[PDB]
């Protein structure tokens, strides 16, 4: 049972003590934390998600800190380090003052009003991108994989993701989500080079297919996804006692085999050479598809079959009587089980599903692929952020000092108490460029003031300090950029826990 | 023990009330609670959290139970009755410390608990409707997270709450009441936000049929199907003969035809509009459409059962009987005054308009944002609960917080004549009252005294009423905290809850005031 100012300070003390070297970790210039173990295992990492798990958590706020970092790590996975940065700041800077000046809420209310100001300021300084131009994206994706600091293989992972993400770009809620990642399906292939890795229509299933799964090459002929209602009926239309004994084999299989016949003969009409049985798969079911003169495929994940519902792009139907191409296995379909390396790989092509190509990844080894693979998984998060937000915003101090003066002027135009939160928030921004100047090796308060002069005149439009070169820079000219979304999102997330930990005055049992 | 336990009971009351204060109301803040060990949960509404809280005292124990008692009645006042009990114990324990008996005190408290309710009894408002409860629109408007709902802040709130107050909604076979009993009132973001409208009929999130289904059928009886037609898998039910390869599959075609028959037999007895909770096959719908009947399938059950219960007669969503299809007796008739699949919220949905024998309306609020549909949802649930208490009780007191200042005074009045110790036993009973604006102002980061004092300075005599806010009390605010009128922001209370919260804290404290020992070996 702990509470109040002490906690309110302890919240900062919990949250803030994290980010210290973690902000130095931000940027390619980075100061790895050494994590020794009580075991003695030494860890040099700039990435909080690893740092967060491994460290003793001294406070339940740290436990809460983990949440929103895992959130963004789940939300995108980009800028996870950055979400815990400004959450402590808001708290760290003002909190003690304004609760000594008595209020949770005036800051809590001044979280949102500072928030949208950036979002509003962002959409001005966030300027649209050409997704029509893959390179207008790629340069950021290149800026993103050099953020991941692999330009060797991942510059290809750029294209492969990009080309894929542009293809895995689609979705419709009626609000029409731009990308869909749960469509995007990579492969993991030894053999071939990742330069020979590509993306083809529909969801490539290597997931259940490392070996024979659906024949080999099923050219036109269909694959049949089964959400039926195929369970072989012990009786005819009724289920009866299970089969323990010869009579039960005779009598019941009489009634069983004709039902799968009643079923998978309704399958043979849709022209499969292969039928992948996710539901209703049982000793009799797939046995009759070879009797139905179609390859049967056993006890398979519907995740695939849902990916496959995005691969051939069909739906899946539980209809026992109605089983068709449109019902399952839409389009002409291409079912190709290719051995890339030593493993046979179903490639479902001829996608009938909007855009929708999925990723061949074949590395000479699994490992040589993996370096592409992770940044390609990063690039898709990047690409979609460009897709979800097609406004590229200049990275760092340009997007940073810009909003601050607004917020100050905001605070100044508001000239209430909430001015102080904005004055805290606008100043809370300046850490990262300072941190970048901290990171680069130059004198920040100079460069800060210098960057203020960049805002005092330019409004720091494209001008931050560039932590790599540690100088006032044109992020447009530098090509230093990023989507508003992850910029917004990571920031918008950094607001949230500061709202939380300031709201929460009682830690009890 | 003794005073020490009666301080420890206070310390039990103290430590607890400290939290539920900070958790009190919407201004009440979420609080980390360790649930077991590594399990810590961030919540408020002590009655909720006290249950995840593990008490250090039977004193704290019984109080959680007391609020849990109060909770079983209503979750409202739970955090209060606790907070009140702490106030109580801290009031009289001093006197009990001082010269005063633990028995002599609670007399002038309990009997003042009779007095306060006797005012809360003589304080009511039977019309909580137009001036509303915590106004009318302001219940939802507060609970609005104002995005596209804010410009509609009165519009929606006046829409939804007047919809929440009373609009036409057939209950099961249409019992008339206010429709917070059930809301097929819905929200779907589409078109624009002003275009959000109450609908005359039934809102349905649904699969509207196809295949030559009439997209609108005026004046149609209904088949609301809890069922899923599909087909009944049968190789041989009818026409066993083998003549053409046509015929062998025409044997198993008869799963469909007996449906086709009984579909039309359901058409023949009656309905032109069919509502199926699950899927019907492409021929099943086709049977309705060749029957000329509109078949809306895969119909949302909550809406559908609310329709099916309102649809008239006894219907396939109120029926478990399925023959593979079941010809109606026209006691299976659902009923729709007229049936329309209409584009609403950029969405064509079947709108059952009322019932062929009965009347209903719903809402689907047109937004640009699911977030709109995320919030008025609450605002409904707020206003629904707000106006629910309005609806089952037209007896409600004006003000939730304006009572306190009057009550103390009203007790201060009632105090002075009692004399002896119990003039004061009323006063300290009136001192327990005063936390109500306080924790509010505290959770709202407001100065409690400058309100409750200013509150106590609204009077000529003591009453809560907008006619005299100057010469009497009225209403309350939360964020500022100050009194309002009725339809101003003006708070109310359903007269049921407080007296119970009053009753409980008075009684728990005295039994807490009961014992001087806790012994063990």
PDB file of C-alpha atoms in Angstrom, chain B residues 103-294:
ATOM      1  CA  UNK B 103     -23.478   4.314  23.366  1.00  0.00           C
ATOM      2  CA  UNK B 104     -24.440   7.910  24.146  1.00  0.00           C
ATOM      3  CA  UNK B 105     -23.019   9.214  20.863  1.00  0.00           C
ATOM      4  CA  UNK B 106     -24.542   6.991  18.201  1.00  0.00           C
ATOM      5  CA  UNK B 107     -27.981   7.818  19.537  1.00  0.00           C
ATOM      6  CA  UNK B 108     -27.817  11.380  18.203  1.00  0.00           C
ATOM      7  CA  UNK B 109     -26.209   9.963  15.069  1.00  0.00           C
ATOM      8  CA  UNK B 110     -28.619   7.172  14.117  1.00  0.00           C
ATOM      9  CA  UNK B 111     -31.571   9.327  15.136  1.00  0.00           C
ATOM     10  CA  UNK B 112     -30.082  12.082  13.003  1.00  0.00           C
ATOM     11  CA  UNK B 113     -29.789   9.439  10.299  1.00  0.00           C
ATOM     12  CA  UNK B 114     -33.533   9.343  10.791  1.00  0.00           C
ATOM     13  CA  UNK B 115     -33.543  13.127  10.545  1.00  0.00           C
ATOM     14  CA  UNK B 116     -31.367  13.469   7.450  1.00  0.00           C
ATOM     15  CA  UNK B 117     -33.439  10.924   5.556  1.00  0.00           C
ATOM     16  CA  UNK B 118     -36.572  12.717   6.787  1.00  0.00           C
ATOM     17  CA  UNK B 119     -35.223  15.666   4.846  1.00  0.00           C
ATOM     18  CA  UNK B 120     -34.062  13.449   1.992  1.00  0.00           C
ATOM     19  CA  UNK B 121     -37.604  12.133   2.242  1.00  0.00           C
ATOM     20  CA  UNK B 122     -39.067  15.633   2.193  1.00  0.00           C
ATOM     21  CA  UNK B 123     -36.590  16.477  -0.558  1.00  0.00           C
ATOM     22  CA  UNK B 124     -37.552  15.050  -3.936  1.00  0.00           C
ATOM     23  CA  UNK B 125     -38.278  15.891  -7.502  1.00  0.00           C
ATOM     24  CA  UNK B 126     -40.886  13.815  -9.299  1.00  0.00           C
ATOM     25  CA  UNK B 127     -40.021  15.459 -12.598  1.00  0.00           C
ATOM     26  CA  UNK B 128     -36.464  14.342 -13.289  1.00  0.00           C
ATOM     27  CA  UNK B 129     -37.344  14.292 -16.976  1.00  0.00           C
ATOM     28  CA  UNK B 130     -37.105  17.687 -18.760  1.00  0.00           C
ATOM     29  CA  UNK B 131     -34.628  19.197 -16.290  1.00  0.00           C
ATOM     30  CA  UNK B 132     -33.311  15.654 -16.382  1.00  0.00           C
ATOM     31  CA  UNK B 133     -31.030  14.009 -13.851  1.00  0.00           C
ATOM     32  CA  UNK B 134     -27.717  15.844 -13.852  1.00  0.00           C
ATOM     33  CA  UNK B 135     -29.575  17.849 -16.463  1.00  0.00           C
ATOM     34  CA  UNK B 136     -30.938  15.889 -19.401  1.00  0.00           C
ATOM     35  CA  UNK B 137     -28.410  16.189 -22.185  1.00  0.00           C
ATOM     36  CA  UNK B 138     -25.579  16.842 -19.744  1.00  0.00           C
ATOM     37  CA  UNK B 139     -25.620  13.264 -18.472  1.00  0.00           C
ATOM     38  CA  UNK B 140     -24.582  12.040 -21.913  1.00  0.00           C
ATOM     39  CA  UNK B 141     -22.772  15.274 -22.837  1.00  0.00           C
ATOM     40  CA  UNK B 142     -20.434  14.833 -19.889  1.00  0.00           C
ATOM     41  CA  UNK B 143     -20.047  11.134 -20.731  1.00  0.00           C
ATOM     42  CA  UNK B 144     -19.523  12.239 -24.315  1.00  0.00           C
ATOM     43  CA  UNK B 145     -15.912  12.073 -25.364  1.00  0.00           C
ATOM     44  CA  UNK B 146     -16.526  14.927 -27.682  1.00  0.00           C
ATOM     45  CA  UNK B 147     -15.216  14.423 -31.198  1.00  0.00           C
ATOM     46  CA  UNK B 148     -18.013  14.447 -33.726  1.00  0.00           C
ATOM     47  CA  UNK B 149     -20.476  13.988 -30.838  1.00  0.00           C
ATOM     48  CA  UNK B 150     -19.561  17.349 -29.269  1.00  0.00           C
ATOM     49  CA  UNK B 151     -21.147  19.528 -31.968  1.00  0.00           C
ATOM     50  CA  UNK B 152     -24.110  17.159 -31.469  1.00  0.00           C
ATOM     51  CA  UNK B 153     -23.413  17.470 -27.763  1.00  0.00           C
ATOM     52  CA  UNK B 154     -26.963  18.581 -27.227  1.00  0.00           C
ATOM     53  CA  UNK B 155     -28.186  17.063 -30.497  1.00  0.00           C
ATOM     54  CA  UNK B 156     -27.124  13.494 -29.751  1.00  0.00           C
ATOM     55  CA  UNK B 157     -27.684  13.867 -26.018  1.00  0.00           C
ATOM     56  CA  UNK B 158     -31.089  15.414 -26.598  1.00  0.00           C
ATOM     57  CA  UNK B 159     -31.605  12.721 -29.237  1.00  0.00           C
ATOM     58  CA  UNK B 160     -30.254   9.778 -27.257  1.00  0.00           C
ATOM     59  CA  UNK B 161     -31.552  10.797 -23.831  1.00  0.00           C
ATOM     60  CA  UNK B 162     -35.013  11.637 -25.140  1.00  0.00           C
ATOM     61  CA  UNK B 163     -34.609   8.269 -26.832  1.00  0.00           C
ATOM     62  CA  UNK B 164     -33.345   7.008 -23.475  1.00  0.00           C
ATOM     63  CA  UNK B 165     -36.187   8.789 -21.658  1.00  0.00           C
ATOM     64  CA  UNK B 166     -38.929   7.147 -23.674  1.00  0.00           C
ATOM     65  CA  UNK B 167     -39.250   6.277 -27.341  1.00  0.00           C
ATOM     66  CA  UNK B 168     -41.136   3.483 -29.033  1.00  0.00           C
ATOM     67  CA  UNK B 169     -39.455   0.148 -28.469  1.00  0.00           C
ATOM     68  CA  UNK B 170     -41.367  -3.098 -28.356  1.00  0.00           C
ATOM     69  CA  UNK B 171     -40.137  -5.204 -25.444  1.00  0.00           C
ATOM     70  CA  UNK B 172     -40.845  -8.910 -25.542  1.00  0.00           C
ATOM     71  CA  UNK B 173     -44.106  -8.762 -27.474  1.00  0.00           C
ATOM     72  CA  UNK B 174     -43.988  -5.080 -26.583  1.00  0.00           C
ATOM     73  CA  UNK B 175     -44.437  -4.513 -22.942  1.00  0.00           C
ATOM     74  CA  UNK B 176     -44.692  -0.712 -22.818  1.00  0.00           C
ATOM     75  CA  UNK B 177     -42.042   0.968 -20.702  1.00  0.00           C
ATOM     76  CA  UNK B 178     -39.182   3.326 -21.305  1.00  0.00           C
ATOM     77  CA  UNK B 179     -36.717   1.582 -23.623  1.00  0.00           C
ATOM     78  CA  UNK B 180     -33.654   1.395 -21.408  1.00  0.00           C
ATOM     79  CA  UNK B 181     -35.141  -2.014 -20.719  1.00  0.00           C
ATOM     80  CA  UNK B 182     -33.516  -2.869 -24.038  1.00  0.00           C
ATOM     81  CA  UNK B 183     -31.835  -0.712 -26.644  1.00  0.00           C
ATOM     82  CA  UNK B 184     -31.682  -1.893 -30.228  1.00  0.00           C
ATOM     83  CA  UNK B 185     -30.508   1.674 -30.356  1.00  0.00           C
ATOM     84  CA  UNK B 186     -27.124   1.346 -32.051  1.00  0.00           C
ATOM     85  CA  UNK B 187     -24.354   3.343 -33.703  1.00  0.00           C
ATOM     86  CA  UNK B 188     -22.585   2.851 -37.017  1.00  0.00           C
ATOM     87  CA  UNK B 189     -20.086   5.382 -38.280  1.00  0.00           C
ATOM     88  CA  UNK B 190     -20.828   6.256 -41.886  1.00  0.00           C
ATOM     89  CA  UNK B 191     -22.142   9.267 -43.762  1.00  0.00           C
ATOM     90  CA  UNK B 192     -21.751  12.223 -41.397  1.00  0.00           C
ATOM     91  CA  UNK B 193     -22.152  12.836 -37.664  1.00  0.00           C
ATOM     92  CA  UNK B 194     -25.126  15.236 -37.644  1.00  0.00           C
ATOM     93  CA  UNK B 195     -26.806  12.580 -39.798  1.00  0.00           C
ATOM     94  CA  UNK B 196     -26.801  10.278 -36.780  1.00  0.00           C
ATOM     95  CA  UNK B 197     -30.487   9.681 -36.191  1.00  0.00           C
ATOM     96  CA  UNK B 198     -32.925   7.722 -34.135  1.00  0.00           C
ATOM     97  CA  UNK B 199     -34.668   5.287 -36.461  1.00  0.00           C
ATOM     98  CA  UNK B 200     -38.319   4.307 -36.364  1.00  0.00           C
ATOM     99  CA  UNK B 201     -38.056   0.565 -36.354  1.00  0.00           C
ATOM    100  CA  UNK B 202     -35.486  -2.057 -35.450  1.00  0.00           C
ATOM    101  CA  UNK B 203     -31.783  -1.495 -36.043  1.00  0.00           C
ATOM    102  CA  UNK B 204     -30.180  -4.631 -37.426  1.00  0.00           C
ATOM    103  CA  UNK B 205     -26.564  -5.511 -37.874  1.00  0.00           C
ATOM    104  CA  UNK B 206     -27.347  -8.340 -40.211  1.00  0.00           C
ATOM    105  CA  UNK B 207     -26.766 -10.252 -43.382  1.00  0.00           C
ATOM    106  CA  UNK B 208     -29.410  -8.859 -45.723  1.00  0.00           C
ATOM    107  CA  UNK B 209     -30.302 -11.453 -48.327  1.00  0.00           C
ATOM    108  CA  UNK B 210     -29.806 -11.607 -52.076  1.00  0.00           C
ATOM    109  CA  UNK B 211     -30.618 -13.775 -55.091  1.00  0.00           C
ATOM    110  CA  UNK B 212     -33.837 -11.980 -56.006  1.00  0.00           C
ATOM    111  CA  UNK B 213     -34.908 -11.241 -52.495  1.00  0.00           C
ATOM    112  CA  UNK B 214     -37.087  -8.140 -52.403  1.00  0.00           C
ATOM    113  CA  UNK B 215     -34.829  -5.604 -50.769  1.00  0.00           C
ATOM    114  CA  UNK B 216     -37.853  -4.002 -49.106  1.00  0.00           C
ATOM    115  CA  UNK B 217     -41.117  -5.674 -48.156  1.00  0.00           C
ATOM    116  CA  UNK B 218     -43.802  -3.421 -46.693  1.00  0.00           C
ATOM    117  CA  UNK B 219     -46.110  -4.906 -44.037  1.00  0.00           C
ATOM    118  CA  UNK B 220     -44.494  -8.311 -43.628  1.00  0.00           C
ATOM    119  CA  UNK B 221     -44.799 -10.991 -40.980  1.00  0.00           C
ATOM    120  CA  UNK B 222     -41.400 -12.225 -39.836  1.00  0.00           C
ATOM    121  CA  UNK B 223     -39.552 -15.467 -39.372  1.00  0.00           C
ATOM    122  CA  UNK B 224     -36.847 -14.700 -36.819  1.00  0.00           C
ATOM    123  CA  UNK B 225     -34.630 -17.780 -36.866  1.00  0.00           C
ATOM    124  CA  UNK B 226     -32.385 -18.644 -33.981  1.00  0.00           C
ATOM    125  CA  UNK B 227     -31.702 -21.536 -36.361  1.00  0.00           C
ATOM    126  CA  UNK B 228     -29.309 -21.930 -39.254  1.00  0.00           C
ATOM    127  CA  UNK B 229     -31.037 -23.504 -42.219  1.00  0.00           C
ATOM    128  CA  UNK B 230     -28.122 -24.737 -44.325  1.00  0.00           C
ATOM    129  CA  UNK B 231     -29.334 -28.064 -45.633  1.00  0.00           C
ATOM    130  CA  UNK B 232     -29.902 -31.310 -43.750  1.00  0.00           C
ATOM    131  CA  UNK B 233     -27.299 -33.600 -45.203  1.00  0.00           C
ATOM    132  CA  UNK B 234     -29.155 -36.569 -46.593  1.00  0.00           C
ATOM    133  CA  UNK B 235     -28.383 -38.724 -49.612  1.00  0.00           C
ATOM    134  CA  UNK B 236     -31.811 -40.389 -49.619  1.00  0.00           C
ATOM    135  CA  UNK B 237     -34.896 -38.757 -48.260  1.00  0.00           C
ATOM    136  CA  UNK B 238     -37.224 -38.790 -51.285  1.00  0.00           C
ATOM    137  CA  UNK B 239     -37.339 -40.187 -54.838  1.00  0.00           C
ATOM    138  CA  UNK B 240     -35.038 -43.173 -54.272  1.00  0.00           C
ATOM    139  CA  UNK B 241     -35.405 -44.213 -57.923  1.00  0.00           C
ATOM    140  CA  UNK B 242     -32.299 -44.325 -60.118  1.00  0.00           C
ATOM    141  CA  UNK B 243     -33.177 -43.186 -63.637  1.00  0.00           C
ATOM    142  CA  UNK B 244     -30.782 -40.442 -64.782  1.00  0.00           C
ATOM    143  CA  UNK B 245     -27.617 -39.245 -63.054  1.00  0.00           C
ATOM    144  CA  UNK B 246     -29.967 -36.315 -62.571  1.00  0.00           C
ATOM    145  CA  UNK B 247     -32.064 -38.563 -60.334  1.00  0.00           C
ATOM    146  CA  UNK B 248     -29.332 -39.917 -58.035  1.00  0.00           C
ATOM    147  CA  UNK B 249     -28.457 -36.354 -57.044  1.00  0.00           C
ATOM    148  CA  UNK B 250     -32.171 -35.552 -57.186  1.00  0.00           C
ATOM    149  CA  UNK B 251     -32.426 -38.041 -54.321  1.00  0.00           C
ATOM    150  CA  UNK B 252     -30.151 -35.914 -52.131  1.00  0.00           C
ATOM    151  CA  UNK B 253     -31.764 -32.825 -53.657  1.00  0.00           C
ATOM    152  CA  UNK B 254     -34.695 -33.498 -51.345  1.00  0.00           C
ATOM    153  CA  UNK B 255     -32.979 -32.091 -48.270  1.00  0.00           C
ATOM    154  CA  UNK B 256     -33.436 -28.836 -50.186  1.00  0.00           C
ATOM    155  CA  UNK B 257     -36.968 -29.382 -51.490  1.00  0.00           C
ATOM    156  CA  UNK B 258     -38.611 -30.217 -48.157  1.00  0.00           C
ATOM    157  CA  UNK B 259     -37.025 -26.948 -47.096  1.00  0.00           C
ATOM    158  CA  UNK B 260     -38.254 -25.336 -50.333  1.00  0.00           C
ATOM    159  CA  UNK B 261     -41.649 -26.811 -49.495  1.00  0.00           C
ATOM    160  CA  UNK B 262     -41.634 -25.737 -45.863  1.00  0.00           C
ATOM    161  CA  UNK B 263     -40.067 -22.389 -46.745  1.00  0.00           C
ATOM    162  CA  UNK B 264     -43.065 -21.772 -48.988  1.00  0.00           C
ATOM    163  CA  UNK B 265     -45.182 -23.495 -46.336  1.00  0.00           C
ATOM    164  CA  UNK B 266     -43.778 -20.854 -43.991  1.00  0.00           C
ATOM    165  CA  UNK B 267     -44.524 -18.370 -46.760  1.00  0.00           C
ATOM    166  CA  UNK B 268     -47.975 -19.935 -47.105  1.00  0.00           C
ATOM    167  CA  UNK B 269     -48.899 -19.636 -43.438  1.00  0.00           C
ATOM    168  CA  UNK B 270     -47.061 -16.435 -43.244  1.00  0.00           C
ATOM    169  CA  UNK B 271     -44.145 -14.132 -43.603  1.00  0.00           C
ATOM    170  CA  UNK B 272     -42.621 -11.969 -46.275  1.00  0.00           C
ATOM    171  CA  UNK B 273     -39.497 -11.067 -44.272  1.00  0.00           C
ATOM    172  CA  UNK B 274     -37.232 -13.644 -42.678  1.00  0.00           C
ATOM    173  CA  UNK B 275     -34.619 -13.037 -39.991  1.00  0.00           C
ATOM    174  CA  UNK B 276     -32.130 -15.842 -39.416  1.00  0.00           C
ATOM    175  CA  UNK B 277     -29.588 -15.715 -36.600  1.00  0.00           C
ATOM    176  CA  UNK B 278     -27.328 -18.112 -38.501  1.00  0.00           C
ATOM    177  CA  UNK B 279     -26.711 -18.902 -42.132  1.00  0.00           C
ATOM    178  CA  UNK B 280     -29.274 -20.199 -44.583  1.00  0.00           C
ATOM    179  CA  UNK B 281     -27.998 -21.828 -47.721  1.00  0.00           C
ATOM    180  CA  UNK B 282     -28.146 -20.176 -51.110  1.00  0.00           C
ATOM    181  CA  UNK B 283     -31.233 -22.203 -51.960  1.00  0.00           C
ATOM    182  CA  UNK B 284     -32.885 -21.508 -48.590  1.00  0.00           C
ATOM    183  CA  UNK B 285     -32.767 -17.750 -49.177  1.00  0.00           C
ATOM    184  CA  UNK B 286     -33.698 -18.580 -52.785  1.00  0.00           C
ATOM    185  CA  UNK B 287     -36.742 -20.440 -51.489  1.00  0.00           C
ATOM    186  CA  UNK B 288     -37.808 -17.318 -49.618  1.00  0.00           C
ATOM    187  CA  UNK B 289     -37.081 -15.195 -52.685  1.00  0.00           C
ATOM    188  CA  UNK B 290     -38.999 -17.497 -55.024  1.00  0.00           C
ATOM    189  CA  UNK B 291     -41.627 -17.426 -52.296  1.00  0.00           C
ATOM    190  CA  UNK B 292     -41.271 -13.661 -52.694  1.00  0.00           C
ATOM    191  CA  UNK B 293     -40.323 -13.438 -49.032  1.00  0.00           C
ATOM    192  CA  UNK B 294     -37.357 -11.269 -48.031  1.00  0.00           C
TER     193      UNK B 294
END
